[PDB]
Write a protein that binds this ligand. Structure first.
Ligand SMILES: [Co+2]
Length: 258
């Protein structure tokens, strides 16, 4: 079998195949707002998704993933704690089975209904594959999801979920603007971490937005209708595909806001 989120292959088994799962810079972590350090020396975050170019959306059996053309600097992330340019390559979602869970990062132990991960990689490394092998190769943008008013930017994804219900299924997803997935405020917390799924490489500079985005009940409901399984196998709803919080160790979490 493969790694996953089930009893016999979930986050608790990962360390056997990827020993780094027990490393010193593992993600996600809990964000204790009473001890996070405000650092007024962080250049403002710069999100430039003006010429963004999405390609397709896919169900790899772990989540839905929207792939982007990262051959050029069309949709990048700079500023904040980042040095250089980071190219957006993919966006996926971690969701729960209940509104009270689903996010990977937590704030004062509170879990959100879901967490969006916008994955970017350092252009000083040539490509994603080379980037994941560097302590500062990736820059992932995390956005918490909370039930409220429907998010138009997410409705685009919601409307195609039917076509990619099972593992391995993919659909064309061009003309998708990721700007519609952001909240109003760009305030964030940041700390050095890793990928949250195998190979769990400690190559990412985490940027987690303080302000979640709102999604309607109908939308969140549709985001839980996807399947972990491939067509024809016993149906396993793709819910609770999140890795719990990991030991922060001596890492310091910094806030961009007072
Ligand atoms: Co993720």
């Amino acid at each position: 079998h493969h790694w996953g989120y089930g009893k016999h292959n979930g986050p608790e088994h990962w360390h056997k195949d990827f020993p780094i799962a027990k490393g010193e810079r593992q993600s996600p972590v809990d964000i204790d707002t009473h001890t996070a350090k405000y650092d007024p020396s962080l250049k403002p975050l710069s999100v430039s998704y003006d010429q963004a170019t999405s390609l397709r959306i896919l169900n790899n059996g772990h989540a839905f993933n929207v792939e982007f053309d990262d051959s050029q600097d069309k949709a990048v992330l700079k500023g904040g704690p980042l040095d250089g340019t980071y190219r957006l390559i993919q966006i996926h979602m971690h969701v729960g089975s209940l509104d009270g869970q689903g996010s990977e990062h937590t704030v004062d132990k509170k879990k959100y209904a879901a967490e969006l991960h916008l994955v970017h990689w350092n252009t000083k490394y040539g490509d994603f594959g080379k980037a994941v092998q560097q302590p500062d190769g990736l820059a992932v943008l995390g956005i918490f999801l909370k039930v409220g008013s429907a998010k138009p930017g997410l409705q685009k994804v919601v409307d195609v979920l039917d076509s990619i219900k099972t593992k391995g299924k993919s659909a064309d997803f061009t003309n998708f603007d990721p700007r519609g997935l952001l909240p109003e405020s760009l305030d964030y917390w940041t700390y050095p971490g890793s990928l949250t799924t195998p190979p769990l490489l400690e190559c990412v500079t985490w940027i987690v937005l303080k302000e979640p985005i709102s999604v309607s009940s109908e939308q969140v409901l549709k985001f839980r209708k996807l399947n972990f399984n491939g067509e024809g196998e016993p149906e396993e709803l793709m819910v609770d595909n999140w890795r719990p919080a990991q030991p922060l160790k001596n890492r310091q979490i910094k806030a961009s806001f007072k």
